[model samples]
Target chain A: HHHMKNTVVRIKAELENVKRLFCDDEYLWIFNIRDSTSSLTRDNIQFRKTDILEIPNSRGTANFMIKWTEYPKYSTINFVNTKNSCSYEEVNNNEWRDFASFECRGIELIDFFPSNNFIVEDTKGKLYYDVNLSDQNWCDYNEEHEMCVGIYNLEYEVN
Target chain B: MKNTVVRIKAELENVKRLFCDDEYLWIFNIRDSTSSLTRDNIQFRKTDILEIPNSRGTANFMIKWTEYPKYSTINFVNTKNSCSYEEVNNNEWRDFASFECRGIELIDFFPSNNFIVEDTKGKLYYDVNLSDQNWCDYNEEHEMCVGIYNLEYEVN
Candidate 1:
């Protein structure tokens, strides 16, 4: 298990513009890596010790505990499960541990163009996939922001 | 992503040792269509997968799924063989044993189990055998770890 604490996430892209991720009002944004004013970083974000669970009736898969932090607001963080495409739910606090969880398939390294990416899915059973032109288009169409909700990569180095 | 109802069926044909003559172990692949997870490691994940353990705590044949759909069932017919399972406190009935995999540890060939280790910290990791090195070897060579003369695990 790679250390989640002090971990930094970067969404690799060749867009020449959106290189970093930002967080605001329970949403994510992608922008120039240098333009990180509201993104999660090694300093601002917090990840509790991941729990490895024994999922019931599983053939032979792994499950982990997710959710933790003292982010800007606690309301934005919630729970994660190992469903079809890993999904999460919006909850008030750590009480999410009481609810039901599923068998986890663990995180996967995907094969994308230009660069590979690390993707995480929420409870919503849809493949929103990597943020693409449609996301860029969606950004300009909706809030005129640069961030889109999708998969990104996390790299944390400890020496 | 329409209301896609999916089904599948398959069988092993002319399979011999379930491994190459070189005897290098082969592994099965898994892909969760829902999540972008491609757990390219060892172990059988769904009921669509089954295993016949040998006397020396080694895997004999690892059954695979033709296509374990979002909705499917597996039936453990009469094997007339020794089988084991696990259950929690209620203990009303013993179910299939939970199989967990590990890395850089003594290999376990048991169907399902538990353990304690030094480098490990947390307890959420499930316990079972059939990991990185153990899997359903579908290779066909004279030399083999196990033979697949008969395999027709029924589906519910």
Candidate 2:
């Protein structure tokens, strides 16, 4: 038993070309951001509220099923161990454990915001990719390290 | 005029790092992060608002805060996109256009005519181009953008 926050976040990378938005444990996501449409830059997914799993001994464990912008059809195919610090996977739902959101500016960022760009321990230090930031696939940004491998900007839908 | 709602901001690129005895400050423009910061270096004790001097003159730059949905934004008197050097009341500045951002405000004092934001409580004083500084801490760990590194702003 877990919960989801009312927050909807738009995840952008700090230093990598992480545009595919589709996480995989493999599979070589898409790379032709230029050929894609507006749907190429946006996503419609979220992280299950961290720490809400209520099992027998693994009570504090949970998994965040990161759905693609194309849900229903694709379903929640990606799985991130909400309680553990591991690489992001497509469907590693079998394991349930406790995870920790890395600490920044003297606080544990269980919750996120769009102003300050950040990254997830579950994905090392990368968020999205750079087909080019607008051009052949130009998106937008003053730098490249501003990509995912750099730092990810997590925008929350504040209410 | 000696009263106007001024807007102040902090942005990256133009930001600088200054080193002292056992301390350091991360300001938008080190050359200007001082208009105040150290003992003699930091000449003023500012609150959310303070009076500062820039190329224009002395103006009270009241750093105002308003709670946004998730992050708090800022506004000031003169910015890159614009500036109302003419002093005005807080409510008056509110009527004028200015720049905006979340958590911390982003600005460039050099440009002096772009990013614009107005605070309902802005008290325009001595002129100091838009600038911001995280004059307390800096940790080289965690690959996240904080202080004046990564953020967006607007000026109207």
- Candidate 2 to truth, TM: 0.17
Candidate achieving the largest DockQ: 1
Clashes of each: 13, 64
CAPRI-style quality class for the chain A–B interface of candidate 2 = incorrect
- Those runs of model 1 whose alpha carbons end farther than 4 Å from true positions after fitting are A1-5, A10-139, A142-159, B1-29, B32-38, B42-156
lDDT of 2 by residue, A64-137 (tens): 22112221111111223343332323232222222223211111123332211112222333344322221112
Which RMSD values do the candidates have, in order? 19.2, 22.1
Model 2: per-residue Cα lDDT over B5-83, one tens digit each: 2233333322231111101111222121213311111111111121121223221122212111121223233433332
lDDT of 1 by residue, B1-156 (tens): 111111111122222112111111222233333444332322222222222222222221121222221111112222221122111211222222222221111122222122111111111122212222222232233333321222211111
Give the CA lDDT, 0 to 100, for residue A31 in model 1: 15
* Interface RMSD of the candidates, in order: 15.3, 22.5
Candidate 1 lDDT score relative to the true structure? 0.22
